[PDB]
């Protein structure tokens, strides 16, 4: 009111400099950004073969949460914990005479791609987790097939870094169980079951399904509106 005034402003072409807006949709990202985005895009426009694309189908947050909860107990020794265990055994064994068995038989998760493979081959794993990332995918593409034929229950899980957190590596490609306390044997059969139900059981069917072939939405709408009008007038 005062000596103050409502002036509005006309931004309708041919008048008033346009105001500041969010041009984020328009900014000219660095080539490296551009490339990693179009890698994602090109990678879906192509029809992808069924031995890839059995990935993309990842374990879900709920089941997976339960499947970390279990594993997270079974982490491998910490550096201190081993130092600690050594001195425990280095001392106690060599004198109290113990058979280098003043240590308890350890239960931890098994890891490293090459390790886990031979475990599968030897029917020793009971639950193999495979990461959904992994950039030279070949490292891991054969694992579903592998598990399935060794009759090993598996799941393709979101997060190679998260497989890393539970093993103190930056990333871990694969994580597996082979051992387990009787206290946990139970929830493991349960965990395994859901997991088989989404993967190993669904494996043979997934294997027939190509993926991708997906339009961007500017040319989705193009055909969603071409196909709405043309046929049903």
């Amino acid at each position: 009111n005062p000596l103050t005034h409502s002036t509005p402003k006309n931004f309708g072409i041919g008048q008033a400099v346009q105001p500041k807006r969010n041009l984020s949709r328009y900014v000219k990202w660095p080539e490296y950004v551009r490339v990693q985005r179009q890698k994602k895009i090109l990678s879906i426009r192509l029809k992808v073969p069924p031995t890839i694309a059995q990935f993309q189908y990842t374990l879900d947050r709920n089941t997976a949460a339960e499947t970390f909860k279990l594993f997270n107990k079974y982490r491998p020794e910490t550096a201190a914990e081993k130092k600690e265990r050594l001195t425990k055994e280095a001392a106690a064994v060599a004198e109290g005479k113990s058979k280098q068995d003043a240590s308890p038989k350890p239960y931890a998760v098994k890891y490293g791609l090459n390790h886990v493979v031979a475990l599968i081959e030897n029917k020793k794993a009971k639950l193999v987790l495979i990461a959904n990332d992994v950039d030279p995918i070949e490292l891991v593409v054969f694992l579903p097939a592998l598990c399935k034929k060794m009759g090993v229950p598996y799941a393709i899980v979101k997060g190679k870094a998260r497989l890393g957190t539970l093993v103190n590596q930056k990333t871990s490609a694969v994580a597996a169980l082979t051992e387990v306390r009787a206290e946990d044997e139970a929830a493991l059969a349960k965990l395994v079951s859901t997991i088989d139900a989404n993967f190993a059981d669904k494996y043979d069917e997934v294997k027939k399904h190509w993926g991708g072939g997906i339009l961007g939405n500017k040319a989705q709408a193009k055909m969603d509106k071409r196909a709405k009008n043309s046929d049903s007038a």
Binding site: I13, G14, V17, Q18
Partner: protein, 252 residues
């Protein structure tokens, strides 16, 4: 023998254009948001001579829709446009001399200049003093528009090709006899080093297909084939006929 004249032109040593005095390139506005949804007003601030060009240019200044400032464009002036005039560029603009409009929004028979071959190439067809192009059709599905170029050729382009209503200014320039050598001289002095022209037939054989002989003569047909090769193509390249043209031309 030697490399003939028309082969040395390509390396552009003494052969580049004489550029120092030219006003700048002549171009329509960048086909931005204003021009393709509505129109935008400008003012021709000056219409002016471009060295080595037939037709005068028109400095036309507009407002920047995005910054507080004046961005000035260089147009080729259509006959009639004037200092002070307001120029309107845009889809939804009106049909008077000087304005710039997408060939879509002009009835057939409209007469426009500086037209784009594809939308937004900032102007490509009929720019020479005198020249223009006439819209002869439209095909609203796949919005094409058909025009007759100055040559005589008819072509079709996007209806979003922009043109400018009118003809290019300074026409008739070519009706005035040059009269003397010196005027051609000063003519090409502001163009390129293409004048005068020694006849190939006054040269020696190292110099030319046409060189040599105890009298001056071409000594073989001067209609050369398309398939011919550099050093061979002097004369009537790919000529599909030859001789004095008789009776009305004009394409049918």
């Amino acid at each position: 023998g030697r490399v003939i004249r028309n082969q040395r032109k390509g390396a552009g040593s003494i052969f580049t254009s004489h550029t120092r005095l030219r006003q700048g390139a002549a171009k329509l506005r960048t086909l931005d948001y204003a021009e393709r949804h509505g129109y935008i007003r400008g003012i021709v601030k000056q219409i002016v001579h471009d060295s080595g060009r037939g037709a005068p240019l028109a400095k036309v200044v507009f407002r920047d829709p995005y910054k507080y400032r004046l961005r000035e464009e260089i147009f080729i002036a259509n006959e009639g446009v004037h200092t002070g005039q307001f120029i309107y560029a845009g889809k939804k603009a009106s049909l008077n001399v000087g304005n710039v409009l997408p060939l879509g929004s002009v009835p057939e028979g409209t007469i426009v200049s500086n037209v784009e071959e594809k939308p937004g190439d900032r102007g490509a067809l009929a720019r020479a003093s005198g020249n223009y192009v006439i819209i002869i059709g439209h095909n609203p599905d796949e919005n094409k528009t058909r025009v007759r170029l100055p040559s005589g050729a008819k072509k079709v382009i996007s209806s979003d090709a922009r043109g400018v209503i009118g003809v290019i200014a300074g026409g008739g320039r070519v009706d005035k006899p040059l009269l003397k050598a010196g005027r051609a001289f000063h003519k090409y002095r502001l163009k390129r080093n293409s004048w005068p022209k020694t006849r190939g037939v006054a040269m020696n054989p190292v110099d030319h297909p046409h060189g040599g002989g105890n009298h001056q003569h071409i000594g073989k047909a001067s209609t050369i084939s398309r398939g011919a090769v550099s050093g061979q193509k002097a004369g009537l390249i790919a000529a599909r006929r030859t001789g004095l043209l008789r009776g009305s031309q004009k394409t049918q």
